[PDB]
Design an enzyme around this catalytic site. Structure first.
Site, PDB file in Angstrom:
ATOM      1  N   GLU A  81       0.855  -1.178   0.000  1.00 45.45           N
ATOM      2  CA  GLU A  81       0.000   0.000   0.000  1.00 45.45           C
ATOM      3  C   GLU A  81       0.894   1.232   0.000  1.00 45.45           C
ATOM      4  O   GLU A  81       1.808   1.344   0.819  1.00 45.45           O
ATOM      5  CB  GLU A  81      -0.942  -0.028   1.202  1.00 45.45           C
ATOM      6  CG  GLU A  81      -1.812  -1.283   1.194  1.00 45.45           C
ATOM      7  CD  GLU A  81      -2.872  -1.304   2.275  1.00 45.45           C
ATOM      8  OE1 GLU A  81      -2.923  -0.356   3.087  1.00 45.45           O
ATOM      9  OE2 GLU A  81      -3.659  -2.277   2.306  1.00 45.45           O
ATOM     10  N   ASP A 117      -8.242   8.934  -4.945  1.00 47.43           N
ATOM     11  CA  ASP A 117      -8.064   7.816  -5.855  1.00 47.43           C
ATOM     12  C   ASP A 117      -9.136   7.851  -6.943  1.00 47.43           C
ATOM     13  O   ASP A 117      -9.848   8.845  -7.115  1.00 47.43           O
ATOM     14  CB  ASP A 117      -8.083   6.497  -5.077  1.00 47.43           C
ATOM     15  CG  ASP A 117      -9.406   6.244  -4.377  1.00 47.43           C
ATOM     16  OD1 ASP A 117     -10.374   6.985  -4.634  1.00 47.43           O
ATOM     17  OD2 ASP A 117      -9.475   5.303  -3.555  1.00 47.43           O
TER      18      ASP A 117
END
Length: 167
Positions: A14, A23
């Site tokens: 991550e 995002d």
């Protein structure tokens, strides 16, 4: 103390963000995949960040604060594992390195998702590494995220952080 730890492990998998990040779904994020909000509003995302931290940040944070946020997420991941009937006995017998790999899976998929690896978890519970790596490789988790799965499975086999030597 440890060349590679759980923070850098999940930084490779991550991304590590020291600025609020939006995002494709519009979800605002910061640190090691810490979801601030899912509303496409940067002001509320920063406001949430301000309450979590102890300062009036403008969206930028330090690595020390990201490790503080992450340590809180890890404490909750361990609580979910030890509170689960399926994962709790595996966590007990696993060493420190392999414990990080189980937490890594609970980070990607939920506690209920990791608890779906019935046969693979029995292999891990019996310290039958390598046999567990074969069963974990034959999974949807390996299909969707082959490279992350390879690193995590290798950690279960070796217990040596070798897969994360330099990302």
């Amino acid at each position: 103390a440890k060349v590679v730890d759980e923070f850098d492990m999940l930084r490779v998998d991550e991304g590590l963000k020291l600025t609020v990040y939006q995002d494709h779904l519009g979800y605002w994020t910061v640190g090691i995949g810490h979801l601030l909000t899912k509303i496409k509003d940067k002001a509320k995302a920063i406001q949430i960040l301000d309450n979590l931290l102890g300062r009036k940040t403008n969206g930028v944070i330090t690595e020390k604060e990201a490790r503080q946020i992450f340590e809180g997420d890890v404490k909750k991941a361990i609580q979910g594992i030890l509170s689960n009937a399926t994962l709790s006995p595996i966590y007990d017998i696993l060493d420190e390195v392999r414990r990080c790999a189980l937490i890594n899976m609970v980070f990607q998929m939920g506690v209920a998702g990791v608890a779906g690896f019935n046969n693979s978890l029995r292999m891990l519970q019996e310290k039958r590494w390598d046999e567990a790596a074969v069963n974990l490789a034959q999974s949807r988790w390996y299909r969707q995220t082959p490279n992350r799965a390879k690193r995590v499975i290798s950690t279960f086999k070796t217990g040596t952080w070798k897969a994360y030597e330099n990302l």
